[PDB]
Amino acid sequence: SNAIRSIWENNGFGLMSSKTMTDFDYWISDFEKIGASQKEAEQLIVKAIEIAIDANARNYNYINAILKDWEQRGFKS
Ligand SMILES: [Mg+2]
Numbered sequence: 001s002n003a004i005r006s007i008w009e010n011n012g013f014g015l016m017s018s019k020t021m022t023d024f025d026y027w028i029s030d031f032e033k034i035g036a037s038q039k040e041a042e043q044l045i046v047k048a049i050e051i052a053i054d055a056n057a058r059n060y061n062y063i064n065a066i067l068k069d070w071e072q073r074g075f076k077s
Contacts, residue, residue: 001025003042007049013058020060027067036076043077044070
């Protein structure tokens with residue numbers, strides 16, 4: 001959770017809320033349920049955060065939409 005918290009907190013998202021950490025923990029679990037490693041799942045979240053930074057949509061809603069796409073497509077990495 002350290003890497004995800006660091007990219008979030010150093011890129012103008014503000015503090016990582018307890019809710020959002022819970023949400024990302026659950027996302028890691030959900031990617032694991034379709035065969036991603038913990039590490040690969042973490043990498044996916046980092047990438048979605050990078051995409052949100054570049055689009056200037058630095059919020060969980062935007063990141064969640066990205067991750068839902070990837071999860072249904074079955075993207076492990
Ligand atoms: Mg927890």
